[PDB]
DNA sequence: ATCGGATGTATAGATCTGACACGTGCCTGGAGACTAGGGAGTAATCCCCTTGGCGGTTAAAACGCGGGGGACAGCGCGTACGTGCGTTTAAGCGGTGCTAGAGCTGTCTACGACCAATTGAGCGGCCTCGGCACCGGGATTCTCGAT
DNA sequence: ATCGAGAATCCCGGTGCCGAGGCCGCTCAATTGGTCGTAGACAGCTCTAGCACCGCTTAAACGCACGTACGCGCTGTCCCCCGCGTTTTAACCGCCAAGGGGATTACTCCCTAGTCTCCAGGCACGTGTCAGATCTATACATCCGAT
C-alpha cells in the first residue's frame, strides 16, 4: 500500500523547505496539476519524472519517498526542480504585497502557493481537458486518459499508476471514440486532433519543447493553433510548462477576482463582459500590477479563491 | 354596333369598361376584359333571377321580393357559399327547426 | 343622375321568366349585388396584374379572378360563358 | 278551460317569425339607442332614416345569427334552454371576443 | 338618459324565436342587450368616423353600409 | 414499480409543445400528401421547398386553432375528451360548414 | 401517388392536439381531422395552382401559396 | 443645388419617405398623392414597428436571449391586447402558440 | 447582381437599435417584420384609396391616411399613431 | 402537509462556428429645382328632409300567478383511452448526378391610351291599372283532454 | 292509445290602392376613325434548384398488454320559465311647423405630376466577430405518486 512517514521511516528522505515556502495542500489539488491524490491524510501521491512518489511535509521539512530504499540525492533533485525550489516565494510575496495591499491581505492567510515546473505534453493535454469544466471532473478525465493510453508504472493498494500518454499514442486510431466512452465530451477530438497536428504538421515534439526558449508572445501565438488551445489554455501552458512567469490566465475565477477585489472594468475593450480582447486586457492589467512573475501571483489568488 | 349586342350580351360593355378604368385598378386595361366581366355578371344575374323566380312561383306570387331572393340564395349550396358572409335586408331566414326541439311522438 | 343596373337586370329577368315581375325594393338588392360582385372580381384582377408585375387587365386576368372567386360548379359555367362571349366578340 | 301544453306554443311563433320578414324590434327605442350611442362619439349628430333602418337590419341579422349559433351550442350541451354560457361560447369561437 | 332598456324582453324573445329557440333563460335578456350594445358601438364608431372624414353632420345609410362592409358583414339593399 | 396517472403525461407534453416551436408533422409525408392533392388540379407539378414548408406551417396553425376551439366546445359540454361532434360544432360555428 | 393522407399518423394528431391545449383524445378524432386537413389543403392548393397557372409556370413557388393563404384568410407571415 | 438631405430626416423619421411615396405612386391607389401622406404613413409605420420591437425586446429579455427570434415576436403579439386585435387573422411563421391550459383540465388537490 | 429588391431591413434595424441598443435580430425575424410592414402598408393604403373613391375625391392627402389609421388601428394604438404622425407632418412642414 | 423518486435548470479554469455585423465598392433611385394646369378649397344659395311637437289610438309591454317539464346533482357501470414496453420503419441526413424550366435579356410589334366628331340609349318624368295586402266568412288540421 | 271540443290556420271571395311598369323627351356618355407610344409576345441563353436515386442512423410510429378515470344511462328534486289573464304605457300614426345642412354653381389659387440633371443611401458582396451550443457530471430546485 501507500507509504506513510510514520509506517516506513527508513524509506523517506527530506528536503529543507519551510511551510511558508510550500503548502502541498494548497498547490497539488488547486488545478495546476491534476495528477496528485491525498491517498492518506497529509500524504500526496502521484507520478513525478516517470515514477511514483508520496510527499508529506512537517514544519521545516518536505519528506519524500518497486522502490525498496530511500530516495537518492539525484532523485530528490527531480523533486526540487518540479517545485522550482530555487525560487524564493518569500521574496515574491514581499514584492507583490508591497505593490498591492489586497494581495497582502490574502497572502497572510494563503502562504506557500508556488508554481510547478511541468512537462509540456502532460500540461498541454491536461489543460485541453480543463476547458469549460470543473477540477473534480477534469481530474477524473485525466486519470482515465492516462490509464487507457499511458505506460503502466506500479500498483499501490488498488491504485495502478500510469505515465502520461505519448504524442504517438494520443494520435492513434479511434482515440477520439475511446475518450468519448471515457466521458471526455467534445474534448475527445481536441485531444486526438491536437496530437496529430503536432506530429503531422508542426514537426513533432521538438516543436513544443523549443517553445520554452521562445518568447511568451511567440509561444502563446504558437499554441493557439492547436485545437482546444485558445487564449486561456495557451496561457496556462506558457506559465506552467514553458517558463513564461508573466503569463496570466483569465478564466471565470480571475474574472470575478478582478471585479470584486479591484473594482476592475475594461477600458480599451468594447464589451463590458468576457471577450477575447477584454480577456487580453485583464491579463495586461495583472501584468502591470504585479510585474514579471504576475502569473505566479495569479496562482496564489486562484488557489485562495477555490477555498 | 353596341359592344353589348356585338358580344351577344345584355349587360353594358361600355359601362363596365368605364368603371374598370375610372376605378384605376391598373395602369391599362384590355379590350376583352370588360366583355368577359359583363358575361360573368350576366350569368350570375341570370342564375339568381331564375332561382328567385322559381321560389316566387312556388309561393303563388308573380312578383319577386327580397324574401324570394334570400330563399333562392340559401337554397343553393354554391350560391350560399358565394354569399356566405352577407345579409339580405328584410330577407328573413331559412325556416328550419332542430330535430330535438320537435315534440316527442 | 345616379347610375344603376336595373334596366339590365330587368332584361335578364325577362329572358329567364317572361311572365314574372320584380319589385324595385329587390331590384335595389340586384344593383347592390352586381356592384359587389364587380368590385370583388376587379379587386382580384388588380392584385393579379400587380402580382405578375403587369400593368394591363386582360381576359386572362378576369378569367383567373373568376376561377378564384366563384366555387367549382358555378365557376365552370362562368368561365365557359365568358369564353364564349369573348370568342364571339373577337370573331365579329 | 283550454290550456296548451308548454312548448307547443313555444314551437309556434318559431314558424311564424321564420316565415315573417318584419323587424321584431320597436323602431323608436332602437333609434333612441342609436342616438345615445352616437353621443359618446360626437355631439349633435343627425341620422338619415335609411341609416337607422340599415343599422337596425344589420343588428338583428347579427343577433339572429348569434342566436342560431347559441342554439346549436345549447342542443350540443344536451340542453334545450339557452344560457349565457352559450352566448359567450358562440362569441368566443366565432372570434368576436 | 339610459336607453338600452328600450330593447324590451318580448322583442328579445321574438329574435330568439326567429333564431329557432324553444326556451330562454332570464340572464339572456341582459346578456344579449350587452352584446347588441357592443356591436352597435363598433359599427357606429366607423360610421361616425366616416362622417367626420367627409366633414358632414348627418350619418347617411351609405356610411353605415361602408362601416358594415369594413367588418365583413356586408349588407344588401341600400348601396 | 413506477406507473404515472393518466392525467399527468397529458399536461406534461402539453407544456412541452406549447413552449417548443417545431412543426409537429414529418416533412416527407406532408410533401407526398401535397403532391397527391395537387395531382388532381394539374399533372406533373413541381413544388418549391419553401412552398411545401409554408403549406405545412399554415396547416399546423389552422389545426392548432381548430383543436383549441374543439377543446373549448368539449369543456362547454362538461367533457374533457374531444369528440368529432365537437369538431363539426366548431366548424359550423366558425362558418366553415 | 395515392393514399398519402395516412402519412399524417395518429401521434402527429396527438401532438397537434397537445399543442392546442387538448387534454384527452377520442378515437374518431384522427379520421375527422384527416378529413378536415384534406379539405383545407384542397382549398388552399386549388388557389395556389390557379395562381401558378395564371403566371404560365410549372413551379408552385412559396409566393403563390402565401397569396392563396391571404385570400383564404390566414395571411401567413414569414415566407416572402 | 444645396446639400442633399433626405425627406425622412427632414421629418425626424427613420422609415423612408421617398420609398413610401414611390410605392404609393406605383400601387395604383389613386391618381394623385399628397406630399404629406407618405410622411404620415411612414410615421405610422415606424411607430407600429417601434411598438412591436419594444414588446419583442421585452419578451427576449424575459427569456434571457440577446437576439430576437420569431417566437418572441409571436409571444409579444399575443400578450398585448391591441396588437392581438390588429393581427388576429395573421399567422406568424414558426411563432408557436401562447402557453395556456384551461382551468378545468388541471388536476384536483 | 440580383436586381434592386427593396426591403425595410435596414430601417427596422435602425428602429430596433434606437429602442434597445444592445439586442440583435435574426433573419427570420427581419423577414417577418418586412412582411408585417408591407401588410400594414397595403392595408392602410388600400383603406385610404377606398376613402378617396368614396368621397369622390382624386388625391390621397394626409387626412385620408389619418382616417384609415383610425379605422384600422384599435383605440389607443390609433390615438398614439395619429398623435406621432401629426407630429411628424408638422415637423416636415416646418422644413 | 410530508416524503422519496423523476424531471428540469444553473454551472463548470473554454472553444468552435454558422450566422450576423460591419466595412467598402458601386451605381441607381431619391433630391433639387423648375413649369403647368387642374383638383380642391371657398363664397353664395336653395330646397328638402330631418328634427321637434301634438293628439288620438290601441298594440304591445308589464305584471302577476299556477304549474309542469326540464336543468341539475348524485350515482353506478363499463369500457376505452391513457401509459408503458418491445419491435419495425421510413424520416432524415449526407452524397451524387441530371436536367426543366425560372429567370433574365433583346427585338419588334400590335394593342391599348387618347382625341375629335357623332348619335343613340338608359335616366328623370309622368300616368295608369292590376298584383297584392287586408277584412271577413267559411272549411278543415293540429292539439289536448275524455274515455 | 283512439275520439270530440276548441283554437288555430288555410281557402276563398270581395274590396280598395299605391307601386311596377309602359311611353316620352333628352343629353350626355358609348361608338367609330385615326394616330402614336410602349407592354409584352416571342426567341434565346444560363444556370439553379428541383427531382431522382441511394446508403446509413436512428428517432419515431405500431402493436399489444394492462387498468382506472370519464362518458353515459338512470333517478329523484326543485325551480323557474312557459302559458295565459289583466292592467298600463308608450309606441304608431296621422298631421303640423321649420330651419340646418347637403347638394350645386362659379371663381381661383396653390399643389402635385412631369422632366431634367446630379449625387449618396442603400444594396451586393467580402471579410471580422462573435451568441448559442457544446458532452457530461453535479448541485441544487420543482413536480408528482403515494401517504
Author numbering:
A (entry chain K): 12 to 76, 83 to 324
B (entry chain C): 15 to 119
C (entry chain D): 33 to 124
D (entry chain E), F (entry chain A): 38 to 134
E (entry chain F): 23 to 101
G (entry chain B): 22 to 101
H (entry chain G): 11 to 119
I (entry chain H): 30 to 124
The authors write:
BER can be initiated by OGG1, a glycosylase that recognizes 8-oxoG across from cytidine (C) and excises the adducted base leaving an AP-site that is subsequently processed by downstream enzymes in the BER pathway. Mutations caused by oxidative damage are primarily prevented by the activity of base excision repair (BER), which eliminates 8-oxoG in duplex DNA. Cryo-electron microscopy structures of OGG1-nucleosome complexes indicate that these effects originate from OGG1’s ability to flip outward positioned 8-oxoG lesions into the catalytic pocket while inward facing lesions are occluded by the histone octamer. Cryo-EM structures of OGG1 bound to nucleosomes containing 8-oxoG revealed the enzyme uses a DNA sculpting and base flipping mechanism for repairing 8-oxoG in the nucleosome, providing a mechanistic basis for the elevated mutational density at bases facing the histone octamer.
To obtain mechanistic insight into the preferential repair of solvent-exposed 8-oxoG in the nucleosome, we determined a 3.3 Å cryo-EM structure of OGG1 bound to a nucleosome containing a solvent-exposed 8-oxoG at superhelical location (SHL) − 6, referred to as OGG1-8-oxoG-nucleosome core particle (NCP) − 6. In the OGG1-8-oxoG-NCP − 6 substrate recognition complex, OGG1 is engaged with ~5 base pairs of nucleosomal DNA at SHL − 6, which buries ~1086 Å2 of surface area. The interaction of OGG1 with the nucleosomal DNA is mediated by a network of non-specific interactions with the phosphate backbone of the damaged nucleosomal DNA strand, as well as extensive contacts with the orphan cytosine and 8-oxoG (B C). Interestingly, we did not observe a direct interaction between OGG1 and the histone octamer, indicating that nucleosome binding by OGG1 is primarily driven by the interactions with nucleosomal DNA. At the center of the OGG1 binding footprint lies the nucleosomal 8-oxoG, which has been evicted from the DNA helix and positioned into the OGG1 active site. In this conformation, the extrahelical nucleosomal 8-oxoG is positioned in proximity to key OGG1 amino acid residues that are important for 8-oxoG binding specificity (G42 carbonyl), stabilization of the extrahelical 8-oxoG (C253, F319, and Q315), and 8-oxoG excision (K249Q and D268). Cumulatively, this data shows OGG1 is in a conformation poised for 8-oxoG excision. To position the 8-oxoG into the catalytic active site, OGG1 binding induces significant structural changes in the nucleosomal DNA during 8-oxoG recognition. These structural changes include a 1 bp register shift in the nucleosomal DNA, significant minor groove widening at SHL − 6, and nucleosomal DNA bending around SHL − 5.5 to SHL − 6.5 when compared to 8-oxoG-NCP − 6. The OGG1-induced minor groove widening and nucleosomal DNA bending facilitate extrusion of the 8-oxoG from the nucleosomal DNA into the OGG1 active site.
